[PDB]
Design a protein around this ligand. Sequence first.
Ligand SMILES: [Mg+2]
Lengths: 64, 135, 189, 32
Amino acid sequence: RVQPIKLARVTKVLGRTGSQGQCTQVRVEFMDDTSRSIIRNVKGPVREGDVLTLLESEREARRL
Amino acid sequence: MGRVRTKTVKKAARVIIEKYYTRLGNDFHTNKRVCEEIAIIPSKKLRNKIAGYVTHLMKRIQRGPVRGISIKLQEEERERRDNYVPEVSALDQEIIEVDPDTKEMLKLLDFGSLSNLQVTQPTVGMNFKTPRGPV
Amino acid sequence: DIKLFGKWSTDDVQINDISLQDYIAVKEKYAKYLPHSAGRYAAKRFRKAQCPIVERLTNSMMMHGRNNGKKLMTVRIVKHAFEIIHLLTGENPLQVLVNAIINSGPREDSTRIGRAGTVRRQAVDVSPLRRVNQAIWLLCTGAREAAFRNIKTIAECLADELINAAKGSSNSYAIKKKDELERVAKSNR
Amino acid sequence: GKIGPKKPLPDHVSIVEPKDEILPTTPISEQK
RNA sequence: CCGAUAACGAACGAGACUCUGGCAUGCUAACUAGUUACGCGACCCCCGAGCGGUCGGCGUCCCCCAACUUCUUAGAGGGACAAGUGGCGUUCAGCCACCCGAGAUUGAGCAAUAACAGGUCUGUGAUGCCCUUAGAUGUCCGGGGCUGCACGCGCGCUACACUGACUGGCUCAGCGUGUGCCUACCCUACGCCGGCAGGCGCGGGUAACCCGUUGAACCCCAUUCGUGAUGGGGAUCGGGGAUUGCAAUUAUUCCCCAUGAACGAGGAAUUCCCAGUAAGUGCGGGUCAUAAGCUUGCGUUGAUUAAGUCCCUGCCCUUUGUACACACCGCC
Ligand SMILES: [Mg+2]
């Protein structure tokens, strides 16, 4: 029933966020489906072309 | 980052390019050597900053008309402007599109009924003027 | 052909998850005899990912002021702890360290200071580089806390910390802290 | 160096003035 | 800085500049610097090497009786410019990445207009006014004080231990000081005595010549200890011995043997910091007859995190509002 942990690869970096620069928003496409892609805010040093894991499918989508 | 060149180097580079464009070239290590004798530069750092900007500006000049003047580009302009005069004028067209409203004006000036004039059909609809405001 | 600390070839180690393959540096050109190759790894962003992971462990293990420049002692400690983990498990200490890092690195966290909503504020994902950094930091902190006021040696406590993290037994300080962080991130979703 | 210093201002660049040296004539060769 | 332009032409500041660090087996040189090579040696191997291995042992500017400058010293120069390539950008100013390269942001110094009732009259034979000027607020001498303690605060040092302490062995620096106008007081090798602090003789050095090849600490390798207020910590305190000085009591400092107190990582708060940096760790200089828990420098080991933001604290530019202009610690 619960959604399994999946993987998403960063394609683009959408700039910092978090009121202190401590997060960066990145557009990530799921390794399962190349077409399906969302935007998520992540912490730590991120560069385009790296894979990060997701414990949930949807959390957030906004443009600053 | 932090590689902005100031007035002291930019004006000097422009002046020496204007004066010695022929001697100057695309080689940084040769422009730094010609800068030894074409001008008195107190500091080696100043002289090679100037030489680097000179090479950059010459790369720009070889393609386009930079604000720094050059006698070859100036004479090329002075050629293009006074030349490419067409063998036949664009003002000796055999037929001329003339609106009937414009046709009556020549009648008073008794220069109408010329062969080169062709009385057209004026547009009907008066559909000029853009729609007002938004949309 | 390299045999870090004279033994335990590096080429036999396989990285488990795709997310940390580019950031865990154990194989091929990341094959050095010693975890002491000071080479200006902080001069640019994303350069410590090219630093071999044993050297990162060594750098993180010398902390709390009393031993800050003593990197030779830390190299010795890592060498011994590798001997103990090989003795206990029978498998490659580098593989054990890699698996411990994979299992210790948290996958989610919390952030934002918006009046401290529920636990911290709003849940956030973590980058692979921060996963590796926090895993190494948690392992070193767990070993240090385990070996502070007791007879067990730093090498032994580092060994058991890495072993428990690699097997995921939740008997390790790093695993417990990671679980707590994931729990509060879930609450701050 | 009597009425003052000898070194120029460090940011002062003085560019010498060349001559014409155009020479648009036909290629000849002086014999001497 | 590029550009737009009722502005044009300038001046200061920034930058540029000076010193320092990084590279030059390229040049100039070196008995107050060395390296190689050779000759004497000393020790090991000797089966058998022998152009064998070690020597901070002696020599070859003790002038005819070797060369060279890599190491060291320091001068002249060179070298790096966003210069080359790719992308972004008006394709402008520039930005990002990469190659080659020692180096693609090394640190400092200097530093505008205007101002503060900021600090110094206890730096000055800088100084206006005022006070005092012989029972002196001048100056000198003796003694005491500047240290004095129910308490609060700031800069620090040592620690709370086993990533440790003790004992022994081994092993590596760079800054820089050194015999005094007055002015008396230098750095110290070596030998002897003592357990130590020290003492007693002999030198050397006004200095790349002597200390000194600065045998530094940490670190490294072996020993003992075993999670305890314990061999952690060394506060407090007794007794004894030296050194400086005219004088050591309110202990100047140092040495030895005893005492082993709090302290088991510290609340609210809060400081500093981005690469040879923080930190650990010693060594110089200043003060110094005697002296560093201070400061100014130097080396040694040497990281975690970050290449962002305006959230807090502030700063700069523009617009805006103002009843403020002693300028929001305002005004009312
Ligand atoms: Mg003891």
